[PDB]
Design goal:
Structural class of chain A: mainly beta
Distance between the termini of chain A: 10 Å
Number of domains of chain A: 1
CATH topology of chain A: Immunoglobulin-like
EC number (chains A, B): 1.15.1.1
Largest interface: A-B, 22 and 23 residues
CATH architecture of chain A: Sandwich
Oligomer: homodimer
Strand content of chain A: 35-45%
Family (chains A, B): Belongs to the Cu-Zn superoxide dismutase family.
Bound molecules: uridine-5'-monophosphate, copper (II) ion, zinc ion
Subcellular location (chains A, B): Cytoplasm; Nucleus
Pfam family, one (chains A, B): Sod_Cu
CATH superfamily of chain A: Superoxide dismutase, copper/zinc binding domain
Cofactor (chains A, B): Cu cation; Zn(2+)
Number of strands of chain A: 9
Helix content of chain A: under 10%
CATH class of chain A: Mainly Beta
Shape of chain A: globular
Chain lengths: 153, 153
């Protein structure tokens, strides 16, 4: 049983805590926690390639994409490893996260430990948008908050 | 990974940016960067086990010690993997870090990616300090600043 964790912070009000749990190597990873201080509605939620916060969330680079695929949603075959969709916030600006994903991992070449989890400004269109950027970033816009994913107890 | 990075943050502000570089998996890791806002003198400098900053630096747990050894200095055979000795701050409160270490790694069982880098209140006695805590923590005191170590470009 591998566990990981991520504290999300940015330059505004957005903060969060996200936990990861993987009972078996190459089993599914349970993702759970809470994010607050975001606008009501969908916010893109991705693992970005680099655990680099040198100059804030920008330093994290593009979506974690070891298999060189196009951008998609977590339930698409054609997706980046880091493509975890959207979290959904209520009128109180709180998003309770409960995700299970079988593409990310906490070991091996799909390993997300030491990379950056990012919550975005706008919704991720899961690559179903009507432009070029949709199959690269999902049009989710700026990075509100982020954190490096670390090994947990 | 051949490169890693860590942004250290703590009250002061204590602020730091530490870079890691490992040419080959069987080689040493070069560690360089800068830490500011600390008192003149020695500050213990360790990799802690968990990359968990849920409740701040305390959540990081003990020194990274995969081999179950006693605390030491980086030049000692008897040391924790996470034992990187001290960084030394001048009167301007800046520590310029330049270390090479043969025991930490950026892959395999001694991998420090996803763990927490911590700069301490006090000097680390490198396990030579004259009490029992010396061979566990080096008597380096409270955790001034920390960050999760991430994969870098
Ligand atoms: O183009 C899409 C549409 C939906 N989904 C995901 O599928 C989930 C719905 O799954 P189901 O309950 O319809 O099986 C959504 O929450 C969303 O994350 C995608 O990955 N890509
Ligand atoms: Cu320490
Ligand atoms: Zn993103
Ligand atoms: Zn993507
Ligand atoms: Zn130690």
């Amino acid at each position: 049983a591998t566990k990981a964790v991520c504290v999300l912070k940015g330059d505004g009000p957005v903060q969060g805590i996200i936990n990861f749990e993987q009972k078996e190597s190459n089993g599914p990873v349970k993702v759970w926690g809470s994010i607050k201080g975001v606008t009501e509605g969908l916010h893109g939620f991705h693992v970005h390639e680099f655990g680099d916060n040198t100059a804030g969330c920008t330093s994290a680079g593009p979506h974690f994409n070891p298999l060189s695929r196009k951008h998609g949603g977590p339930k698409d075959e054609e997706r980046h490893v880091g493509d975890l969709g959207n979290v959904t916030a209520d009128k109180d600006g709180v998003a309770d996260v409960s995700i299970e994903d079988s593409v990310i991992s906490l070991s091996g070449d799909h390993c997300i430990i030491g990379r950056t989890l990012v919550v975005h400004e706008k919704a991720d269109d899961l690559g179903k948008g009507g432009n070029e950027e949709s199959t690269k970033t999902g049009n989710a816009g700026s990075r509100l908050a982020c954190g490096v994913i670390g090994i947990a107890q």
